[PDB]
Design a protein around this ligand. Structure first.
Ligand SMILES: [Ca+2]
Ligand SMILES: [Ca+2]
Ligand SMILES: [Ca+2]
Ligand SMILES: [Ca+2]
Ligand SMILES: [Ca+2]
Lengths: 90, 93
DNA sequence: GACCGGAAGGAAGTG
DNA sequence: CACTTCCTTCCGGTC
């Protein structure tokens, strides 16, 4: 499983809004609890030392592939739009 | 296709018309990629692999360390050093 | 503190 | 095989 798949899995269920949520309609999302997202991403890949420094590095590798971009100035905010998902499913 | 990354890099490096994206630096086999995204693109172009980027190219170069084909120029951005002895073995069947 | 991106190397897939 | 792909881990730097 890719990180971008797992994040869309969390974002699709409103019950995870406590740790991660959509914000707008254009694919912008925010991690309301980054440490909780990281902890769950770690539990998924059997990576119990996973944290936000490491998970965000994984997100940063998506910039060059046009898969997502940073919401400049918004704490824990990135953009995963329809262009982005199209690139992820190639 | 068929071609290997170390050959493709030697091809570019031999022609100093490519100096804008990759050139020799020392006299001892050291080279720097002045435009790493451009080197990745052409490598992608060559191998019909259109999602190629420095992250994936540099990972390929990192596999050459244990093959004695090249080494990292430590503390110098996008800089590597070819080994004439390693190139020679890479050349053999 | 976020955020950035270089560099190392593990691990699985490809063709 | 010889990469390709996608990270995980670490870290020095900017802001
Ligand atoms: Ca980049
Ligand atoms: Ca770049
Ligand atoms: Ca500080
Ligand atoms: Ca740090
Ligand atoms: Ca620091």
């Amino acid at each position: 499983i890719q990180l971008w798949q797992f994040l869309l899995e969390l974002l699709s269920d409103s019950a995870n809004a406590s740790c991660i949520t959509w914000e707008g309609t254009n694919g912008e999302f925010k991690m309301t609890d980054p440490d909780e997202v990281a902890r769950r991403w770690g539990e998924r890949k059997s990576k119990p030392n996973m944290n936000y420094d490491k998970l965000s590095r994984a997100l940063r590798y998506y910039y060059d592939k046009n898969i997502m971009t940073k919401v400049h100035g918004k704490r824990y905010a990135y953009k995963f739009d329809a262009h982005g998902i199209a690139q992820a499913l190639q």
